[PDB]
Design a protein around this ligand. Structure first.
Ligand SMILES: CC1=N[C@H](C(=O)O)[C@@H](O)CN1
Length: 257
């Protein structure tokens, strides 16, 4: 289950992957099929490694690394963006899904919220964000107090919380917000993208430190997918940029900048 992880996954027939259900990063249809850019890439690569299918678990973003280190899943494939502190806890693949950050906001933006700092500087402003995710951390880092950063389980709840006036802003990656609002059919909601002063992130498939040999194998296929253009064929129908991911590396994103 360490150096010989791939072998066991092959003779097991499947790999356990962690997702959050946030299109177009991850998605689950009523059928039960797991799609989205991250699981499709993960699915294709595992297939190439002799691993016949993926079995997915839904959880919130903050439970993913703990679940991985506890050995509950074989990889995180969910748009879990590379950050120094995350990089120190897992063995990431090379970059896959890149995106900026966005705001879902009341029409006309009554509070003038354009950066995470704007939220911090207004004591009335509450921001909705996934628990343990990048947006929550960026709000906290900009100086939004804990009790004004509100944990939101998923996009549909964030939208509803915004409509109810529980939050003044809901924050996800641009592609996630765009997808959510276009399906929302709500003239009172408005998108602000990208968030001013917020970093641009890329994710990878995240593995246990002791599963680095599996990570290497996954990466050999990722690199071949990138080289052929097949990588672009999988992720770009979802709105992602292949070039962005190919323009940087794990080490650059994991660097303390
Ligand atoms: C795809 C996605 N990634 C963020 C993260 O990696 O924390 C989450 O906070 C929100 N959605």
């Amino acid at each position: 289950r360490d150096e010989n992880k791939l072998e066991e996954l092959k003779e097991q027939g499947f790999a356990r992957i962690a997702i959050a259900n946030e299109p177009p990063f991850t998605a689950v249809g009523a059928d039960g099929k797991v799609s989205g850019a991250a699981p499709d890439v993960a699915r294709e690569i595992f297939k190439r490694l002799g691993v016949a299918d993926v079995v997915a678990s839904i959880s919130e973003y903050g439970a993913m690394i703990p679940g991985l280190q506890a050995g509950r899943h074989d990889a995180i494939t969910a748009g879990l963006f590379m950050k120094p502190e995350r990089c120190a806890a897992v063995a990431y693949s090379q970059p896959i899904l890149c995106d900026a950050e966005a705001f879902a906001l009341k029409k006309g933006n009554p509070l003038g919220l354009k950066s995470y700092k704007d939220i911090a500087d207004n004591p009335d402003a509450k921001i909705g964000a996934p628990g343990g995710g990048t947006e929550e951390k960026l709000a906290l880092e900009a100086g939004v107090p804990r009790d004004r950063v509100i944990v939101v389980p998923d996009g549909q709840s964030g939208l509803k919380m915004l409509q109810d006036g529980r939050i003044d802003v809901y924050s996800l990656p641009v592609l996630s917000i765009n997808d959510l609002v276009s399906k929302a059919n709500d003239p009172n909601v408005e998108v602000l993208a990208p968030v001013e002063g917020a970093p641009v992130y890329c994710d990878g498939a995240a593995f246990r430190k002791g599963d680095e040999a599996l990570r290497d194998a996954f990466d050999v296929e990722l690199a071949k997918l990138k080289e052929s253009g097949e990588f672009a064929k999988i992720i770009e129908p979802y709105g992602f940029s292949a070039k962005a991911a190919m323009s940087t590396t794990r080490e650059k994103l994991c660097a303390a900048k």
